[PDB]
RNA sequence: CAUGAGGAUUACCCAUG
RNA sequence: CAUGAGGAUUACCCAUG
RNA sequence: UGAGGAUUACCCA
RNA sequence: UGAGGAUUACCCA
């Protein structure tokens, strides 16, 4: 095995799909980027640490860019108008079994499923009400 | 267009599904919890605010109970041994359109899609390798 | 759903019934008032807080007014001769299940049921003996 | 006209009813408890005093045991995990007549009547939303 | 029950209507935002407070943006060329009954009805004459 | 041509309508007063000024009185028990066309339309919830 | 290390304990 | 935050730890 | 308080 | 400027 593989970050039905690939593991931080100039790339990082005597903490970060072409010094450069940042930390007690962890994963998937409250608000630029 | 409704957090296909329902709205912070004691419940909270002049920021928190060897309705100490905490912060620049936000949501869905690195690692009590 | 609804605070068989309605939720304090000038209204407030790592505390307050018409500066104003205050705090351990909570509610209902000791003393301006 | 008699605190319609009986009268503070160990009993106390020149004040306290997974007659620690505390303070101006007081009692009954906001929220481990 | 809902701010028949939706209710300040880029959105805020012993005071604010596209360095962002700022404070004595408040509301609606002096002056970039 | 005319401030069908009429236009401040005792009259004032290089600013004020009769020493005078004070400022950039201004006006009318959040809260002596 | 509906130029910074 | 059969002009104040 | 100014829940006399 | 207070075209920081 080896779970450090490439995957589809943004799925648009096999056309214009943002796919991300392993690009670095320096300092225990797994990194993935899209085939772009480092300045316009989507970026995903992940790291696990034994945060406490009885806890493990996953730190996941995703960077979604808004690509643009900027003219600096009369020259065009590939760049990012702005970036959206997702920072998530997951703390799991060492007593959690694999089935307990599967439960956490499913919860996170259900949380963001199309049609549910939260993803609906985010996509509509509104709050929950 | 009220989106503060109950939804399925953990989907086990009809049987054993965990539904989470509206339970509090104090301070604009929406809360959903499962039908359990608060020590063993699945909890979800969400709020949005203008983090700065250039950004808006969604703060999403999830609490998942350790289920293996759990005693329903019992007193389980220490608390830190029986619960997992998910803390998500999503920063979005004010220039993001609904379309941009829809993409950001897809990115989050892709990150956690079944079979991808991150969720597979979490579910197996592993890191990246 | 949504439990923030109006209800009958004082029941006098559908005639002269004091009914109270949602009027404010600012700062996480749910408020209800009767259709009156803010100076002569019945008022009910409720708020929940995670008072401790292992406790939740409900703070409920009710204000019963004695309406009157006062002549100030040679002018008649709707006002309250005096007000009666009820302040109750309920501390529930996070380990209490829904059935445990139902038990608490029933206890509070039984405590105040017509004919029982306490409501009998209060209504007769006496103590318990 | 002695009103210090036993009464039904939790009514389950004949079967499983919790009766609470006189157990102490030290210092004019009336006490009622269920037929249990004092660590698992239902307790009720009540006293009245002239809080100030303009008011009288009833202090009512109730203790409700956590029943789910309870071991009858056993030693359950920590105490704070197995008990709920209700603390009620009722302030009544000396001008209140018996009629005024009867109304104040109805207000308290209405507040807790079955199906109303407050009790429904408490019973569901919820807040207002 | 709830009045912290979505509503039509600008009515243009049934199409091109500007709808503002709840977004935040932090610190007793309710906020509504229209959809899409926060940068080009309409904003409405409202709050009430006891300004003094006898008065309650509503503070309402509205922001009407002039939608435009900013281009700099060849990078274009959705922005607001400028904004129009509405700012109103309404003081109401606590002796006001619901009847009195309805009158106050009709006064405000009348002040701005089509054809009347003030809305006509504003709409025509004019003053009084 | 003139917009400094009489108009209906409060519309109650066709009878009991409150009409306000021009009374003064000193120092760029237009004033309207309802008929009868000045002491019990409704008042409306309006003025515009170049607040800065880019902005013009409207300042509008309305006074709703609570009609009452004052009696002192057996002498009765027509007075206002109290007054409700509306106070609004509207800032509009000089780049706003007549089209833009009409939009701003519709926004104000929409903000106060019957049934919408704000006018409903005010009319009910309530806040947002 | 812990906690923040703390911030960001985003594997880094602040406050608090 | 904790405790008071502490007070009130009642979502706020006092004493104590 | 202000027919006080705004980058708009901030700031000046 | 101020979800700053009013006896409301005044006044405070």
From Swiss-Prot, chains A, B, C, D, E, F:
Q: Mutating residue 76 to A leads to what result?
A: No effect on the organization of the T=3 capsid, but with a loss of thermal stability. No effect on infectivity
Effect annotated for changing residue 82 to R:
Complete loss of viral assembly
One example of the protein's molecular function in GO is:
structural molecule activity
**Localization:** Virion
Quick check: keyword Signal in the entry? no
SUPFAM superfamilies associated with the record:
RNA bacteriophage capsid protein
Q: One GO BP annotation here? A: regulation of translation
* Gene3D superfamilies hit by this protein: MS2 Viral Coat Protein
Outcome of residue 45 to A? Answer: Loss of repression of replicase translation. 80% loss of binding to the operator RNA in vivo
Purpose: Capsid protein self-assembles to form an icosahedral capsid with a T=3 symmetry, about 26 nm in diameter, and consisting of 89 capsid proteins dimers (178 capsid proteins). Involved in viral genome encapsidation through the interaction between a capsid protein dimer and the multiple packaging signals present in the RNA genome. The capsid also contains 1 copy of the A2 maturation protein.
> Of which family is this protein a member?
Belongs to the Leviviricetes capsid protein family.
Name of the protein in question: Capsid protein
Upper lineage is: Viruses, Riboviria, Orthornavirae, Lenarviricota, Leviviricetes
